[PDB]
Specification:
Helix content of chain A: 25-40%
Number of helices of chain A: 12
Structural class of chain A: alpha/beta
CATH superfamily of the largest domain in chain A: Tetrapyrrole methylase, C-terminal domain
Strand content of chain A: 15-25%
Strand order of the largest sheet of chain A: 3-2-4-1-5
CATH topology of the largest domain in chain A: Methyltransferase, Cobalt-precorrin-4 Transmethylase, Domain 2
Number of domains of chain A: 2
Bound molecules: S-adenosyl-L-homocysteine, sodium ion
CATH architecture of the largest domain in chain A: 2-Layer Sandwich
Oligomer: homodimer
Radius of gyration of chain A: 20 Å
Shape of chain A: elongated
Chain lengths: 265, 265
Amino acid sequence: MVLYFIGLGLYDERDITVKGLECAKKCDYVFAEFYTSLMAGTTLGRIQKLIGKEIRVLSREDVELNFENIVLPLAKENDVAFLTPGDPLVATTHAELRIRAKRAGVESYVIHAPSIYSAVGITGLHIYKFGKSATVAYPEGNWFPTSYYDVIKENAERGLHTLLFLDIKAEKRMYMTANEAMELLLKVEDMKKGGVFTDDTLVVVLARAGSLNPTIRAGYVKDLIREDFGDPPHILIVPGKLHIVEAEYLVEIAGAPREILRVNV
Amino acid sequence: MVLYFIGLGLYDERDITVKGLECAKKCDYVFAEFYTSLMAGTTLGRIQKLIGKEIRVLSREDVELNFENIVLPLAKENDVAFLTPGDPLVATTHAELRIRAKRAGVESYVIHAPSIYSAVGITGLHIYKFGKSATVAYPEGNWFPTSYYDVIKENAERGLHTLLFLDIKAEKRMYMTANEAMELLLKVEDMKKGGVFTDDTLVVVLARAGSLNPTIRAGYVKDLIREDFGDPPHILIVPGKLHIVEAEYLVEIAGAPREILRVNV
Ligand SMILES: Nc1ncnc2c1ncn2[C@@H]1O[C@H](CSCC[C@H](N)C(=O)O)[C@@H](O)[C@H]1O
Ligand code: NA
């Protein structure tokens, strides 16, 4: 009679919370999805070993089209868990699944876990200063999307930071690198000429948040565009004007050039 | 030889990640602060029991003025941990403590935990649609904070949602309720008269995120301003322009007036 939305966390199998783990262990059935994102620091086998139960993986179609035929039926007579990377309901379409549960007469509860939305706090950038967020999508065929560029523009214009999610082909396990994102943004700049993203733009790259050894780098595009930030996933951020405290953290902790203390503050 | 920043999560001691628990267990000394947020579902005893270590609680002054005199000295010959509610680097000034550690020759590591910043996803509002965040602070003497009002105005103008952290005076055991935040906002409105926050403004209240049955309510200020949302902590959200799916969730899950289903595209 109960469906539990449980977040897996940032990186590996130990990023789930104690509450989430214990709940997963008490559920009769455990489902998971890895189409919204992957857990780069672990494997399905390791998550299964930790939970001590077989995990049935669901595709985007299984969830988006048949959630009520695959998961909800069992949730009527058993305790069922639905695992998702990060924090449940952060993924735009998952909240509606709670409505489907209601329509089916199934109770649902949410057990949270860390999300990159809050984890970016490790970059030293003040969380309250983040504005609208966006996703950098790969252009394809005759389609060249650029709305993420406009989001950066509107945020920076108001002195806010922009959290940029990078494209991912979950099914094919293919990540867009921060390097590719920067190249794309420069191309968009050459197109729109808005003076929004250039070789002189200060950016922050966060790789493998959740790991005990994440990569946190800050610097100008001209210098970071060919830098190796390690294995994915990569998150790109375009800070607005910095608080001196933010700049000092980027210099001391993220290896940013001292120059930011006078140019970007 | 190192210092661990470990978040304890939203509500109770089990909101800590497995990673945070295992790392905390292997530390020689454990410190913590409980003034940046309120963990309404646990106590120091339960936390100590779970981690199996005695925990030394620090005041805002112990941290802000003497972190390097109380905590860092021990991290030079032992592994030390510093626990905080939610995520240690979200809506706190704790990030600067990493600079203090560095200058003291102490390497530090961060272990995330669920944060209210991402937990807002449970309201059904698209997390990427949130703009600049702000804090509703208690007036003090002749000083009456009002900047949070302008934040709402700026976000709303852009169709973005506004997350409002509410004030807290831990030493006085004072936790601002969404009701008190609404009252203050109405007073600021009478002054600035920007039509930003009125009896007709749609708001969303999230109380005790992290618990199994948090209070999630949406409606007009005139109707919610005197509603009982249960024990603290509470956060208040002023949505911008709603997507239909956001409105549907607010109505179905947060008991919002069915009339908000009719969006003015
Ligand atoms: N479980 C919870 N439910 C509702 N609001 C919460 C909350 N935890 C924190 N808050 C809100 O955030 C304020 C503390 S701000 C510190 C937040 C913390 N670092 C985190 O990551 O969550 C509180 O005064 C309250 O308004
Ligand atoms: Na945000």
